[PDB]
Structures are given as C-alpha cells and as structure tokens.
Write a protein that binds this ligand. Structure first.
Ligand SMILES: Nc1ncnc2c1ncn2[C@@H]1O[C@H](COP(=O)(O)OP(=O)(O)OP(O)(O)=S)[C@@H](O)[C@H]1O
Ligand SMILES: Nc1ncnc2c1ncn2[C@@H]1O[C@H](COP(=O)(O)OP(=O)(O)OP(O)(O)=S)[C@@H](O)[C@H]1O
Ligand SMILES: Nc1ncnc2c1ncn2[C@@H]1O[C@H](COP(=O)(O)OP(=O)(O)OP(O)(O)=S)[C@@H](O)[C@H]1O
Ligand SMILES: Nc1ncnc2c1ncn2[C@@H]1O[C@H](COP(=O)(O)OP(=O)(O)OP(O)(O)=S)[C@@H](O)[C@H]1O
Ligand SMILES: Nc1ncnc2c1ncn2[C@@H]1O[C@H](COP(=O)(O)OP(=O)(O)O)[C@@H](O)[C@H]1O
Ligand SMILES: Nc1ncnc2c1ncn2[C@@H]1O[C@H](COP(=O)(O)OP(=O)(O)O)[C@@H](O)[C@H]1O
Lengths: 548, 562, 546
C-alpha cells in the first residue's frame, strides 16, 4: 500500500457498487477464470477491438469475486488496476521497479491489471513473471498485439489470448435496456424500446467508424442530454435519435428510414435530374435494379450486367455517374478502365497481375485492386469491341460466379457491384443492323447472361436546350463570389447548339466552348468595371459571334 | 551488498525445495560440469530450439550441487541468477550503469572462485551501450566468473555471431529435443505436481496418449513442453467441470478432446454418434450426389479407414483423381463431400488449374525466393493450408496447366510435403487431395485410359490412388435432379413465406429440355432461373403475387408458365 | 475559499459586468452546456487556432450563466479558472482540495491544458471536477490522441474562424481601445476593409486576430506618417498597405500600375519566350483570372503540366514566368524529380519524423513553401519520379495543404504549380494523349488545368531566337567592352543552318558558340582585338570571318 498512487482498485469500490453490472458475456468470464487457474501459461490477455467491453468483462469478474462464486483458489484475492499514461526519457523504469517491488513484497496473489500494455512490452517483468508470485491480466487490440508481442517479445510463450469480437444488434439492445434507469435518474425524461432499437440499428448501419456497445450508449446519452437541454416532449423516440444521427453524419433524417420501398420508388427523375432524355433507358435500368434486389435471384451474380452503346457525348457515362451517386451516395465511385491497351494477347494479365516476383505484382491488377477495396463501385469498359477475345473469358467468369482471383492470392467478390460495358458500335444502323453487328462481333452466347442491351437514343435538336440549361444553371454558381447575375435569351442559348454540337464527340466541348468564351470574354470587364452585382450582363448575338 | 539487490540465489531456492524435479539428461549435465571445471575460459552456453528444456538443465545442476553429487572442486558454489533488466533500467546520466556493473564484478572477484554465475537469455548482453557488455571480456577469458547461459538458436546467430571476438569466450552445448520415450519418462516424473495442484488424478494411459498425440498433430512446437501443456489444459478443464456444477480423473480421450478442440483435426477414438454418421455415409452423401455409385464408396472407405485407425500416418488421407464426361457432378461431388464433413461449403481450398497455362504462374502456390518482390507474403496455397490443417484441397480441371505444374504435386502427393519461400515445411498428411479432369470426352474406358497415359507420366500416375471413371447421366434420374434444384430454390424462398406446387408434367418437360448429351445437367440451373425466378420477379413487384401464396406452376403448350 | 489568490474569478466579474465583447457562437455555448450535462464523455475541450476567441467563448458562457438560461443542475455553477501563472507539488494538493471537496459547484476552466498532460488523472477518475479547457488541433493530435486513458473524458468541439459579418461588430467593440493611443479615425470603411480584404490573401494568421493586428499596425503607421514626412484617418489605403507588407503576397485595391502590365503580359512575355501562341494565351489567362479574385478559393492559384518535343521552350517559359513576377530568376523554387528513382525518397522533401538521424533538417519543399508562401515551384521531369510522390501531389491538388514529419500543416492556396515531361516525344497527338492518360491515373489528371502541348520550331520562328541569343552574347561580353557588329546575312545564315526540327534550339546555341566564340577567343588571347572594340562579321563561302 506504499505507492498506490498510480493504481486504482476494483474490489474496494466493488464493496460500494460504483461499477456497472455487465449482464451478458458470461462465457468470457468462465474462460478467463479457467485460464487463471492453471500452473503454467496462466495470466491471460484480452484481445479485441477498442470499445467492446474488455474493461466490462474484468469488472464483471471483479463483481463475481466480491459476491463469491469462483473456485476458492481464486476467492479471497483482490485486483488492482494500473494507468500507463501516468508513468510516461527515463524514470518510467524506476517507477516500474517501485510498483513491481510493492507487488513482490506484498507476498501474495493480489492480481494486477494493465490496460493497453503494448506500450510496456520489457525484459524487466519476465524475470519477475517466470517465478510465480504475480498475476497480470492485460488487454490490447488484435493487430497491435500482433506487433509488440510477436516480433520483439520472445515472451508469447507465457501469455494466453482471449478473443472478444463484438456484440450483435440484439445483444447491444439487451445491454441498453439493462442500462436505462441510471440515465432516467441522471437526466430523467422517458425511454422507448423503439428509440433503443432505432439507435442500435442506425448506429450499426451508418456510424461505420466506432463500435457497438459504446457507440449506442454515446448516441442514446447525447439525445437524452439534448432533450433535457431543449426545455430552455418528455420522451425520447426514433425521430428523437434520427435527428441526432442526421446532425452527426450529414445525411438528413428523411433518407434515414425504410431502405427498400421508399428507395426503389425513387428511381424516378431523381436520375433524370442529372441525366437528360433517355427516359426509356432510365426506366429499363430502374426495373433491372428493382427486380435484382427482390430476393429470388441467385446469391452469386453482379447486381447488374447491362451495357449501352451508340453515339458518344450523349451522356453515356453521365448515366453511370448519377447511378452510383444515387445508390452508393457518391459519384466518385465508378472506375473506368479503357479496353484499348488490352489489344495484345499477353496484356490480359495487366488487370490481375499474375505472379509474385515479377514486374507487375505490387501494383495489383487494374480491375481487382480497385474493387477489393470499395466493393461498391460501378466499373466501366470503354470500347469493349476492341478488347482481345480473351478478356471476355474473364468477364464470363465474373458474371457466372460473383468472385475472382488476383495474383496475390486473394479472392475479390462481385456479388454487389454493377457492370457497364460502353462502346461505339452502330454508326450507320438505327435499330436493324446495330444488333446484328453486336451479335456477330461478340460471342452471341456471352450476351445471353447480360441484361437489357438498350441503345441510347439520339438527342432531339430541341433537346439540347435542356442539357445546356442544366449547364447554365450550374455555371450560374461560378461567379457567386461577386454575385454577378447572368442573362438568358433563346437566340443566344440555342446559338450554342448548332455551334457546339460537332456530332463526332457529342457534347464534351459544350462545357469548355461556352465557359472559356463567356468567362474569359467578361474577365476583363470584371476588372475594369461596367458591371456590379445586380446586372444581368446582357450578352447578345452579334452579326458573326458572341460579343456582349 | 553489491550482488544482493541485482541477484537472487538459485541454490538456496533449490534448497527450499521449490524447484521442479528434472528427470534424465545426464549427458548434458556431465558435459556442463566438465566444461565448468576447466582452467581458463570456463563458460558453457546451452543452445537449442526453444522449448526443449534449456533452463531445466541448469536447475538440474543446482539440485545436484545442493544434494552433493558433483566432483571435488564443485562443492558449495551457490550458483547465482544474475539479471540485467534491473541494472540498465534506472539510469539517466553519463556513466551510471558502469558503476553498478563494476560493483557487481568487484564483489564477484573479491570472493574466491565460488560464485558461479547464471545469466539467462544472454542475447541481452550486447546492448546497454548508449562500451557495455564488453568490459566483461577481460574477466570472462580468464576464469574469474563462470556465467552459465541459455539462448535460442536464432537469437544466438543474430545477436552474438556478429561480435566474433566475444563469441570466442563461450562454449556451446547443443541441447537437442528429446524423443517420445524420454518425453513419456519426463511426463511420468512430473505427474505428481499437477496431480497435487489440481485435486484430480491422471492415468498413465492418458500420459502416453498425450505424448503420442502431441507429436503427430501439433507440428509447430516442441516436445517436452508441448506435451505437458496438454495435461495441464485437461486437468484444468476437468477441475472447472467438477466445480460450479451441482469418474473424477482425466482419461486418455480427454487429451484427444483437447488436441481436437484446437487445430480442428478430428483425431479421436470414435466417440458415439460419429460412428453412426460414418456408417450412415454412402446414403447420407447420396442426397446431394445422384448417380455415381462407384465413386462415393471409394471416398467413403477412405474417410472410414483414416478415422478408424488403419492408415499410414505419413501420407495424405487420399489422393483421388476422378475424370469423365462433361457435366456429370465431379466438382459437385467434391463440394458435397466438403459439405458433409464440415457443413461449410466455403471451408475448402479450391484452386483453378485453368489459369496456370503459363509456366511462371506456379509461384502463387509456392512463394518467391529470398531477394525478390513478394517474399515476406508467402505462398497462397501454403498459407491457406498452414492454418486449417483439415481442409479438402481441389484442383479444378487439371488439364490446362502445361506439364510443369505436375512437378510440384509429384511430391505433394505420397508425402504431404511442401516448402514455401521462407524455407518452411507444411504437412498435408490429413487432407484429401482431389483433382478433376476432362480427358476422354465420349471415349470408352480404354480410350481415356490411353489419354491419361499419353498425357501424364508413370512417376505421376503411380503416385495418386484409384483413377475413378464417371458414368454418363442416366436418362431416368433427371427427375430427382430437378427435385434437388427445386428444393434449393424453395430454400432460397424462405425470407418470404412462398411455396411451390410443381406439377409432374412440368417437372418432366424440365428434365427433358436442357440436358443435351454433350454438356449434361449444366444448362439446368440457368434454365430454372430464367423460367421461374425472373417470371416471379416480374410478377411480385407488380402485385398479383404476395408472400404466403402456394404458387402453382403449369405445363402450357408454349414455354412453361405459372 | 483558499484558492482566491492562486486563481482569479469569473463569478465576481460576471456580476461586476466587465467582460470582453462576445457575439455569436451561442449554438456553441448550447453545445457546451449540453455536453456538460451528461454522464459519460462530459467536460469537453476547445479545438481551434490562435485567434478564435475561446477564452471569449467561456466568457460568454459565464455571462449567460450569470444571466440565466441554464438547466436545473447549474445554479450559476461558479465556474472559475486555474492560473498557470501559479508556478512544489505540495501546494497543488490543497489547491485541488477545494475543487474536490466542492459539490461540483466551483468547477474550473484550465485555459490551455495541452501540456499539463500523475496528479490530476486519479483526481478526475471519480468525476468531480470538469476542467474544461481550450487547446488547438496540433496539440490535441500530438499530446492527447493515442492515450486511451483520457480520450474517454473529452469530447472535442470544433469552432469556425471566419465570421466577417460579426467581426464588424467585434471591431466596433474594440475600435475604442485603439483610438486612445493612436489619435486616429478608423472609419467604417476601414472596419469593413479589414473585414473583407485580408481573409483570402493573408491566410497565414486568422481573421479575428489578423484583423486586429492589421488595424493596429495601420493605426501605428498612420500615427507615424502624421509627423513631418509621410491623410488624417485610416481608410481603404493603409489597410491594403499593411496587406502588402505581410508574407510578400500583394493584395489591395489596385496598385494603379499593375493593371497595365497584367493587360500586357502576353506581349511582354513574347520577348523572352518565342512561339507557342496557345501556350502563352493559356498561361496568361491563368494568372489574370486570379489576381482579380475570379479563381476558386480552395485551389493552388495555378497548377498545370505540359510536355512535347525537346528544345522548344518547356523550361524557358516557366523561367520567364518566374522572371516577370519576381524580377529575378533565383526567386523560383526548383526541384528536379529525376533523382526520385526509389520509394523511400519521399522523406527528402518531407523531413524525417521525430526519432531518426536527420530530424531538424526539415524537408526540401514543405520547408521552402512554409515561409514566403508565394513563389513558383518547378517539378522538372515529373515522369521520372516514383509513382508514390504522385500520390502526395494528388493530395496537394484540390485540397491545398500537406503534412510533414513533425505534424505541422502548411498551405499551398496562393502558389503556382509547374510540372513537365516529354512523354512519347514521337507521337503526334493520340499516342501522347493515351500515354499521359495511362502513366498517371485518370483520378489525378482529373483535377489539373489544361495539359499543354508545345508544337515545335519553324523557320520564321528562328531568326528572332538568333537575335535573342546575339543580344545575350552582347550582354555577356560587354564587360570587356567588345560590342558586336553582325550583318543580317550572317543572322539569316545562322537561323537557316541551325534548324533541324528534332532537337529544337539547342543546336543553335551550339552553332553560335562554335562559330563565333571559337575565333573570338582565339583572337582575344593573341592580342589585336583589345578592349573597347567593335568586331564585324561577314558570311564567308563556308564559315564567317571576323
Ligand atoms: N456487456 C456489457 N455490459 C455492460 N456494459 C457494457 C457491456 N459491453 C460494453 N459495456 C460498456 O461499454 C463501455 C465500453 O467500455 P470499455 O470496456 O472500456 O470498452 P472496450 O470495448 O473494452 O475498449 P476500451 O477499453 O474502451 S479501449 C463501458 O461503459 C462499458 O460499461
Ligand atoms: N528434463 C526435464 N525434467 C523436468 N522438467 C523438464 C525437463 N525438460 C523440460 N521440462 C519442463 O518443460 C518446460 C520447459 O521450460 P523451460 O526449459 O524453462 O523453457 P526453456 O527451456 O528455457 O525454453 P525458453 O528458451 O526459455 S522459451 C518446463 O515446464 C520444465 O519443467
Ligand atoms: N448425380 C448428380 N447429383 C446431383 N447433381 C448432379 C448430378 N449430376 C449432375 N449434377 C448437376 O450437374 C451440374 C454440373 O455439375 P458440376 O460437377 O459442377 O459440373 P462438372 O462435374 O464440374 O463438369 P465440368 O467438366 O467441370 S463442366 C450441377 O448443377 C450438379 O448439381
Ligand atoms: N520559344 C523560345 N523562346 C526562347 N528561348 C527558347 C525558346 N525555345 C527554345 N529556347 C532556347 O532553347 C533552349 C531550350 O531551353 P529549355 O526550355 O530548357 O529546353 P526545353 O524546351 O525545356 O526542352 P527540355 O526537355 O527541357 S531538354 C534554351 O537555351 C532556350 O533559351
Ligand atoms: N444527359 C446529360 N445530362 C447532363 N450532362 C450531359 C448529358 N449528356 C451530355 N452531357 C454533358 O456532355 C459531356 C459528355 O458526357 P460523356 O458522354 O461522359 O462524354 P463522352 O462522350 O466523352 O463519354 C459531359 O461532360 C456532360 O457535362
Ligand atoms: N468575439 C469577440 N469580440 C470582441 N473581442 C473579442 C472576441 N473574442 C475575443 N476577443 C478579445 O480579443 C482577444 C482574442 O485573443 P484570444 O481569445 O486569446 O485568442 P485565442 O482564442 O486564439 O486564445 C481576447 O483577449 C478577447 O479579449
């Protein structure tokens, strides 16, 4: 008791009850008390993620001790904690000597407890430990333990691992409903099982950074404190927590609800807000994605394997960029891999990378290393017609079983991704020879496993005004730093169509063609004068070109 | 008062009887003595792979000194357990560890030559520098202190042999691991300590079974403690089972229970229920593999022999290669087997030999030599098998990889050996290698048994076991195949509450269309999908179908309909 | 009660009404009290940068406490502070005894507790003192980030710096304290000028304090110029003046002589770079769209890469760019990406982390851009570097900052980024297009400006190059006063002879040297061409005599 100033007790304060009961996880306690009852390789170590209940388990064991249920060997033996962030160059070993000598002259079996000892281990506790007078019960995380206790240890022969992965939704619900009254007297508002389960499921699904047993308690206590402060509604409810989750992540409370009906019914113009025209294609793709997640298709298949070809610049990619945006909440998800370099027989191994020990190994394959991470992407395939007739075997293997093999040896999974095989075939035919050319060029049976093979319909000579109109609505945001508004006039706006189409690349220059013109033609006025932040900047169609 | 707070007295500890009774190893104690009794440079160092008892010899020497069984110039020497973890620990100044080390050395050399010293794990002697662990050499190479040490092979080579002028002052005593008989002796010697600690009893048959199993199934650690740990584990488990629960001694099958409770190997003596399952195998496997009566008996007999106790302990549990016409159920038989003895279809290690048409692609299942790109990662197959040493290896369609990959299996088989990049070795002694093919393609048994000979080599066909040939799909049993497929579909339709009322003519037309003689039952799952699943999907999201309805099917004159 | 001297009070000052002006951040105060009235992860800390007003945050918290908008457990809570000017370990026990023995009613506020973290850890383990603090992000991340013992009792609360509309009233509340020393008038124009000028350009300090120091130095400058040799009030002029004298980046209304040069950049730069009309147009449109305030606020004010055939001007253009903005060539940061042939050379431009041999040396890029953050960086031969520095540049683009070994963050939102290479060198347009798309990933080229292409030299373009080289040689051998006399036939002869359209202009320098300097240096050491002389040259049948 001489230097008990860097150490807290667990049984003394247990004699008062300032701890929390840890109902659940009764296997781990039995495993630990069994390990601690051996003769060699005793003093186990708790291995698990941060925020899972390791301290909870050791406290539950402490409470079972103070009650008295364990074998009388372990009975009548106290526990003492330690905090290492208080010890830490030097004199850390001096205080280590002090505490170890204290334990040693205590002359008993007073168990210790050392949290995150991966900062402690070194050679100073092994001569103490391989003698049988002290019992240390530590804790750390999996990969960290694999670091400090495997390379420089040579001590792992005297440490026994114990695994505590994570509780489930149903278990953390029981945990919450056990730990409810304490807060109903801390603040005291009211609690609803609907609120508890909503917190559990929503945290599990959307707060993908922290973990369950502490993550749920954090949100619940935060909502309770907010609703106690709000009195500056005497209950907490599902909305009373969804508001907090929305404030936390950024996604509003609306979309944080039922994710099947109210989502698969949003396959409407919500796409057409980014894509223009091609409503037939949007409808076909929406039906394909709706029926795919019904729950009757085979569980090993891409979530969609359709392709679309024809004229460029119509927004072929734009459909996919909007599609990934709506589904996976990001448009920086699709990955475009051109099928141009893959015109050689040998280069098919570029998108995998076969051997360990050859040129391209560490970089991985172009396709897999960009899929095994972020398994939610939307892969694109430009000019699928120019790829050698050997990658199509790879594609077959993809859309015949939702998995593939890289070179490292890993297995990449494709059962919740979307394939899109763009092209440029069909330059002359409307709907009669384009399908015949697609049948003849590709293997006519490989196409069978594909979904709808729709062709994008051309842009109406009128329906360029809508695309350029979204373009103008966008570029209106550009000069929001000086609030200089812009003009609109059908002659000027339609003047962009016949002079910016150039029907070989569709509408790719239609952004630069107008942005450089208007921006850099007004950029001198923006420094000289002639405008302030209420002026329509009336631009007109001069006899030849677009001056102001 | 110098070596009083940096050292204990191992001799006095042994006098207090609190040490373990070493049994055997008289050769090494005699060698250590006849080295420690030299004139100059008398410092033995016990060397050997970790776990084999490199300290136990020093405790034995201490016990022998205390008892008085040593030569004339070795009596009453009081060997000392020195330590450096508590000398270099608290010192933050210039030249402070030196005063402590010099005080210890001075206290040694003042007394007569009767303070024989013992530093354990002396690979911690070269550091402490910043000229440390190096001022000791002038006293080492003159016979002033004795310094019995103990270090592992790896640490020795890595830490000392880089300091040659210091290694000269040492002598090596290669402490090799003991054999099974010596292990049984040691275990029988130590039995009483655990029998007293845990209030249970331990049987000699249990000790023998422990010393025999711990050598055949845990091939990563070493014997004299690898065995003892099992006895301790089983004693503790029996203690816990006795207590806390309102024929009280360990048995020779509780050890098998432990050594199967980890490493996954089902090693045992056929406890009840297991024998019922094994006897009930050919039929229990038939519910997933209709057809192929000849093959199932062979694999079943292999498993039976392997688990009954009559099989060569150093060779795989079977190396079958079955081949036949396309779409007959080869891969499916393998998967059904793995599902039988694991109930986990994704717990086997299949590798697709269709990818290895190139020569150099073999490196994925071996690794890379030292000094190349992927070296510390290992080999795919070797890594997958080093853990889970009970899987069912598969070689999908081994006819593509050109005849060089046949020169690794050539010794994987018949020994269960393989060596990856780091130079390790793995054991395939309790796996079931299975490698399909498609040689033949229509030809009779004597037109495909020529393809095998002209494709492989005698050194290869001689390795593997019976070359099972698969028959063709009988035109009748396809009704049961369609039955299986509809059962799997109904199993997929369980999140909802749907059932099916499949009619006999519909089932007949199904088994009739999509079994073309060249491809077997392969175009059946896709047909079932495109004729039931999509038709239902177009019919469920648009009303007119709801969960609970026992959906019937019809045999309309056109393609099948509801 | 025995803490009144070692620690000041915020309960007496609350009633006595004297308080620094507080405005806004009421939602932050509400968040503070909401997290204070919790059971776990209570008593937060403040994260930010120097010049937020976090002491002001807790002061407004105290004023609202004494006014009364609190929950039931906050009967004025008598919040206090712990003076770090109270600095052995024996006094601290009794100093903390009053806080411990309290009912959690004299909770303290440890301003800048970053380094305090032995004694207070167990004293906090029981949940009796709040010790709400105020620190910064760097100190949070280097001090209290990895320790899992204390991250269970601290829930950070981020703060927003730029609040121009309220900084107006802040100045209104602080203008008085500077009109007494400086007998000057800082008009409302000066208030809203300090508010809306130094934010985007002087992003080295922060708005609430850099704006205070701006008006402070402006009032000092005005009281200075009041005397004999230099206006009677601060307006929109002295503010911009002080904007210029900070970090070198110029930013005002207009320097009344810079608007002409900027309109004339293309023409002025054509006398040092020759040809490349598209290139000069694009490189000119890039800086004018920035100096006027049109460009986007979170981006380097210039970043693009060009390539093509050799000997065309890919480096000369960037060198002229460094010339026309700083008036000297040495004011360019140039690092050649050729030596970065291995992976582990990333720390050469980043600095090795604490604990290794070269630790105080610092990087080669981040250290040169941290101080004086306006120069132009030249990444010569970017194609040669290991394809991992490309990932650092990935962060650099569209984000505008990077971290080095010590853990500090530097800014890149006002510099120019030049990268060059010669990918392909034989492909006309499509080969090189696919090559640049394939060597760098499309997610890195996405962010860039136009990737330019240089076209190559032609006959009409080489006579001007010859004239430039001859003027340069004159400038060189002017210090022996041997000014040249060259004939137009010889000029055209050189421009014709050195023309080959595969190497560009370097053969022209080679020919100039080997043709003139040979004979000139032969004569100059044998006499007869002594100083103060004018040598003629004339086209001989093959050579050109002197
Ligand atoms: N089964 C449980 N019963 C009671 N409380 C639990 C349970 N599981 C988790 N908790 C609580 O969840 C919180 C997590 O505490 P910790 O045990 O420290 O977390 P951890 O997962 O063990 O990792 P650390 O220690 O936070 S790094 C504590 O408030 C526990 O009381
Ligand atoms: N001949 C023996 N007689 C009695 N017990 C033995 C004998 N050999 C080994 N043991 C026991 O087996 C275990 C071996 O432990 P140690 O020899 O102390 O470990 P070690 O040999 O020092 O190996 P390292 O390098 O320290 S991991 C102990 O439990 C010993 O009691
Ligand atoms: N006797 C059988 N019992 C059950 N399913 C069978 C049987 N014979 C064939 N099948 C089915 O036939 C299909 C093809 O079986 P697989 O074994 O996967 O093909 P395969 O044997 O690998 O032939 P190849 O040469 O590899 S294409 C699967 O859907 C099996 O379920
Ligand atoms: N348009 C130009 N204007 C002025 N000097 C030029 C021009 N083009 C080439 N030169 C000269 O020719 C030489 C080429 O200079 P650099 O720009 O360094 O070469 P480069 O064009 O960058 O090609 P590389 O890839 O760097 S070798 C220098 O001596 C320049 O002065
Ligand atoms: N339906 C559309 N909706 C919105 N923008 C479009 C649409 N079609 C074309 N665009 C514009 O035209 C450009 C060309 O799109 P895209 O088809 O991806 O080019 P490419 O033909 O090179 O694939 C896009 O940058 C986009 O801004
Ligand atoms: N919102 C505000 N309005 C007026 N004056 C303020 C405001 N915030 C702070 N101040 C005053 O200006 C100074 C800002 O310095 P300080 O608060 O120490 O910066 P930091 O928050 O970085 O520590 C304070 O001394 C305070 O008296």
């Amino acid at each position: 008791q001489a230097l008990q100033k860097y150490s807290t007790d667990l049984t003394a304060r247990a004699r008062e009850g300032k701890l929390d009961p840890v109902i659940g996880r009764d296997n781990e306690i039995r495993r630990v008390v069994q390990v601690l009852s051996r003769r060699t390789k005793n003093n186990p170590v708790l291995i698990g993620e941060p925020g899972v209940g390791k301290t909870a388990i050791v406290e539950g064991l402490a409470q079972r001790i103070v009650a008295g249920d364990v074998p009388e060997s372990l009975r009548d033996k106290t526990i003492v904690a330690l905090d290492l962030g208080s010890m830490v160059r030097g004199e850390f070993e001096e205080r280590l000597k002090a505490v170890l000598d204290d334990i040693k002259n205590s002359a008993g079996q007073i168990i210790t407890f050392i949290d995150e000892l991966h900062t402690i281990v070194g050679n100073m506790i092994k001569p103490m430990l391989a003698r049988g007078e002290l019992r240390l019960v530590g804790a750390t995380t999996l990969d960290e333990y694999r670091k400090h206790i495997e390379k420089d240890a040579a001590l792992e022969r005297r440490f026994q691992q114990v695994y505590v992965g994570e509780p489930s939704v149903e278990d953390t619900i029981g945990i919450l409903r056990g730990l409810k009254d304490r807060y109903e007297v801390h603040h005291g508002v009211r609690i609803t099982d609907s609120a508890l389960v909503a917190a559990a499921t929503l945290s599990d699904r959307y707060i993908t950074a922290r973990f369950l047993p502490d993550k749920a308690i954090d949100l619940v206590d935060e909502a309770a404190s907010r609703l106690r402060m709000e009195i500056d509604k005497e209950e907490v409810g599902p909305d009373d927590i969804a508001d907090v989750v929305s404030a936390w992540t950024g996604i509003p409370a609306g979309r944080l609800l039922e994710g099947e009906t109210a989502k698969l019914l949003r396959m409407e113009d919500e796409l057409g807000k980014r894509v223009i025209g091609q409503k037939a294609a949007v409808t076909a793709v929406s039906d394909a994605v709706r029926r795919s997640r019904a729950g009757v298709s085979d569980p090993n298949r891409p979530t969609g394997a359709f392709m679309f070809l024809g004229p460029t610049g119509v927004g072929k990619t734009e459909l996919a960029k909007a599609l990934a945006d709506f589904l996976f909440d990001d448009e920086r998800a699709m990955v475009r891999i051109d099928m141009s370099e893959y015109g050689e027989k040998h280069t098919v191994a570029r998108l995998i990378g076969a051997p360990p020990g050859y040129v391209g190994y560490e970089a991985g394959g172009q396709l897999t290393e960009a899929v095994r991470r972020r398994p939610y992407t939307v892969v694109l395939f430009d000019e699928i017609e120019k790829a050698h007739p050997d990658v199509f075997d790879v594609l077959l293997q993809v859309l015949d079983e939702g998995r593939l093999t890289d070179g490292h040896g890993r297995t990449v999974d494709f059962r919740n991704t979307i394939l899109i095989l763009t092209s440029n075939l069909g330059s002359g035919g409307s709907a009669e020879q384009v399908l015949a050319a697609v049948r003849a060029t590709f293997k006519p049976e490989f196409i069978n496993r594909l979904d709808d093979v729709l062709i994008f319909e051309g842009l109406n000579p009128e329906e360029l005004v809508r695309i350029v109109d979204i373009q103008l609505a966008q570029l209106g945001k550009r000069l929001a730093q000086r609030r200089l508004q812009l003009q609109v006039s059908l002659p000027a706006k339609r003047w962009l169509a016949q002079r910016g189409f150039d029907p070989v690349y569709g509408a790719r220059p239609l952004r630069r063609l107008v942005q450089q013109a208007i921006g850099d033609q007004l950029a001198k006025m923006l420094l000289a004068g002639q405008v302030h932040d209420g002026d329509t900047v009336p631009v007109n169609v001069s006899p030849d070109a677009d001056s102001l």
